[PDB]
């Protein structure tokens, strides 16, 4: 259980590394999402102001 216990400690550490890595990718994704959902909300406000400018 000497290298059976070190072997479990190594896996546990590797498991921790991926969990932390996933939340860092989650945030990364969220920064791209802000841009996306923001890019749509601009052109909807664009098309209303074009419409009431053209009514005039």
């Amino acid at each position: 259980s000497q290298k059976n216990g070190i072997a479990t400690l190594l896996q546990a550490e590797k498991e921790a590394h991926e969990i932390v890595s996933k939340a860092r990718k989650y945030r990364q994704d969220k920064l791209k999402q802000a841009k996306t959902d923001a890019a749509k909300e601009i052109d909807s406000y664009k098309i209303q102001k074009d419409k009431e400018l053209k009514e005039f």
């Binding site: 000497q2 290298k3 070190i6 072997a7």
Partner: peptide, 14 residues
Amino acid sequence: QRQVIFECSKFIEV
């Protein structure tokens, strides 16, 4: 530094 590698690979192999 060679011996603390020889005596700590052995501890993992045990």
